[PDB]
């Protein structure tokens, strides 16, 4: 059982339980980990260490979303569990308008969960994106201990989210059914690394992770020759073979209330909202059964707003490169243009 509320305050352009009155329940923390099936992940809390945390959905926000989202069919998505919880649909559709820069163009993931946050559906969570990037870092570190990626940028080419279902394995018969959205986003990403020299492509593609947000991210064989390292992103951007796509940025304007959220959504119905970071409800503490013996802390997902940026002249890369700032009260990946 968890009852503790938010410990700390968040910036105005990030959403958490602190911005809304949480007295919609149905302060002690005492949970089990060894036999429980709750989720558990690891993120870097420092340049040389990681932090384990188990993001748990806050029923306050889910209710605050179910109550408001009715009569908003244009931006409402419904799901039945085992019970009907409506969430925030992402617009209507997806249109298609240092040195040593490394590219992995045209990465397609098939069957990636779109229920990033418990109160929205759409593009997969940027937390999962950063986890995939860091898994790539770990895989490439075994063959080269001096390889670090300072920051990355994500370009989306094709986005498609529709209702599907997971056929649970038999445990006799199959357990209670579950309905969750899935996505097949086609995306390309840029990497800023400190290697500062060329690396052989065979090990680079051998170390490329496949899993991405419970999906299968694989790159076409004929695009292997396009995996090359360039010293300048200005010429790197002119190089990838896809002339269509969008760049992801953060919405710095205020989104304090869900009414203001829907007001912001209705001017363009093109921006998307998904999980961007985690707000810890408990300070990092060690428990006997962690993911890898690191400090564990029950956290809560934060919903942000992803902007659309068309790269061109007079477009600073500082507005499109994301990284994990590792704040003491929350762990989130945001673009480095915000001070």
């Amino acid at each position: 059982v968890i009852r503790t509320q938010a410990l700390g305050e968040l910036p105005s352009f990030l959403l958490s339980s602190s911005k809304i009155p949480p007295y919609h329940w149905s302060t002690t923390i005492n949970v089990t980990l060894a036999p429980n099936y709750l989720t558990q992940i690891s993120l870097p809390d420092s340049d040389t260490s990681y932090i384990s945390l188990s993001p748990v959905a806050s029923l306050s926000m889910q209710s605050h979303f179910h109550q408001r989202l009715q009569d908003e069919n244009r931006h409402s998505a419904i799901t039945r569990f085992s019970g009907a919880f409506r969430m925030l649909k992402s617009g209507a559709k997806f249109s298609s308008p240092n040195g040593s820069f490394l590219v992995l163009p045209n990465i397609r993931v098939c069957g990636a969960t779109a229920l990033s946050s418990p109160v929205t559906v759409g593009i997969p969570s940027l937390t999962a994106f950063f986890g995939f990037v860091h898994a790539f870092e770990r895989n490439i570190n075994r063959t080269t201990s001096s390889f670090r990626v300072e920051s990355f940028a994500i370009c989306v080419h094709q986005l498609h989210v529709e209702k599907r279902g997971l056929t649970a394995e038999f445990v006799i018969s199959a357990p209670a059914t579950r309905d969750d959205w899935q996505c097949d986003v086609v995306f390309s990403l840029i990497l800023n690394t400190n290697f500062a020299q060329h690396i052989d492509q065979d090990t680079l593609v051998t170390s490329l992770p496949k899993r991405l947000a419970r999906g299968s991210a694989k790159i076409a064989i004929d695009d292997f020759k396009h995996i090359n390292s360039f010293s300048t992103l200005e010429t790197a951007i002119e190089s990838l073979p896809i002339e269509a796509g969008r760049w992801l940025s953060l919405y710095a304007q205020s989104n304090n209330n869900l009414s203001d959220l829907l007001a912001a959504m209705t001017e363009d119905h093109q921006l998307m909202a998904s999980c961007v970071g985690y707000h810890l409800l408990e300070e990092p503490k060690d428990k006997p059964n962690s993911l890898r013996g690191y400090k564990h802390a029950i956290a809560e997902c934060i919903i942000g707003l992803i902007n659309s940026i068309t790269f061109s002249s007079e477009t600073d890369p500082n507005t499109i490169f994301w990284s994990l700032k590792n704040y003491q009260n929350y762990l989130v990946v945001q673009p480095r243009s915000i001070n």
Partner: protein, 329 residues
């Protein structure tokens, strides 16, 4: 004997099948499906036999003649098309050598020793050939192979230094293990998969593309969604136009249905914890008979000591299950 917590990451990760229609002018376009509404007959038993073994009074003769509308999704080959091309990409990896998660050093060491000893003694040749058979004969296409004129499959492996291997007219030839072995590159691909399985952190990627020939306006049967609409297809956006898709888990189950080692075997089921069969629904390898995965895994220590045909069958089943992975806790 099972540890408190253990799990595996899948070693074989297949992509999804995309359906493309090829015009006689050699252009390729994505296949498109449209919703179609049909007027069916009242034919279900419950509308006339709701009470067990007796007719229902309110269902008179006139009330059984009205049509009941049904809405289904419709997909078929456009007229004038030559053939349909289906393409996907399967990846063979080596996560079976290291358990993804474990809380017991004893179970960790026993599992790694067991997989190493199985590789050393029995070998990956049998499992590699069984997996390659399903990909090569179009098992991943499911019902689309049936009622088709002639379909051929072309594979382009990643660490390849030659031509693209192909299998022409699988309906007549290439219908047996010996026929598959007679191909020029069959041994090369089998050794490729064996090397990928054995070498740590190895990768084997196959880009498959099957050309399917169907009669005029022939039917196409893609996967369907689990959630008046009686049939809804899974679809993904390709080039801006919607297209039916065969699914990722469906393909993974199609290229992994090799379990022919169950008691009183008659046809290979999909490899898994229990011999679950969709057609003729039942539970083969039910834990009552002791042939389920859990009982077999419980004899890991004993089986390493003995390492007839039942032993190698148990090893084949055990390693096939381990390849797929799962929360074995």
């Amino acid at each position: 004997k099972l540890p408190t917590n253990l799990a595996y990451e899948r070693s074989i990760d297949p992509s999804d099948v995309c359906f493309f229609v090829v015009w006689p002018d050699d252009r390729k376009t994505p296949l498109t499906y449209n919703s179609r509404t049909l007027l069916g007959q009242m034919e279900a038993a419950s509308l006339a036999y709701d009470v067990s073994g007796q007719p229902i009074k309110s269902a008179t003769a006139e009330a059984l003649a009205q049509g009941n509308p049904h809405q289904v999704d419709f997909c078929h080959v456009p007229y004038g098309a030559s053939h349909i091309e289906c393409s996907f990409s399967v990846s063979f990896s080596s996560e079976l050598r290291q358990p993804y998660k474990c809380n017991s050093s004893k179970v960790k060491q026993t599992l790694v020793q067991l997989v190493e000893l199985y590789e050393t003694k029995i070998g990956w040749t049998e499992l590699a050939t069984r997996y390659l058979m399903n990909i090569c004969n179009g098992k991943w296409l499911w019902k689309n192979t049936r009622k088709a004129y002639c379909w051929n499959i072309v594979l382009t492996p990643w660490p390849w230094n030659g031509e693209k291997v192909g299998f022409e007219d699988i309906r007549t030839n290439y219908t047996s293990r010996q026929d598959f072995k007679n191909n020029k590159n069959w041994s090369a691909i089998v050794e490729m998969i064996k090397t990928a399985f054995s070498s740590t952190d190895g990768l084997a990627i196959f880009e498959v593309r099957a050309t399917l020939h169907l009669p005029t306006n022939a039917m196409v049967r893609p996967s369907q969604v689990f959630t008046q609409n009686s049939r809804v297809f899974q679809s993904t956006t390709i080039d801006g136009e919607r297209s039916p898709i065969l699914g990722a888990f469906k393909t993974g189950a199609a290229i992994a249905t090799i379990d022919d080692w169950y008691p009183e075997a008659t046809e290979p089921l999909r490899v898994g914890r229990f011999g679950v069969h969709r057609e003729d629904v039942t539970c083969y390898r039910h834990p009552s008979t002791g042939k389920d995965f859990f009982s077999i895994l419980q004899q890991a220590e004993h089986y390493i000591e003995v390492l007839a045909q039942e032993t190698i069958n148990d090893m084949h089943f055990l390693m096939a299950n381990l390849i797929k992975g799962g929360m074995f806790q």
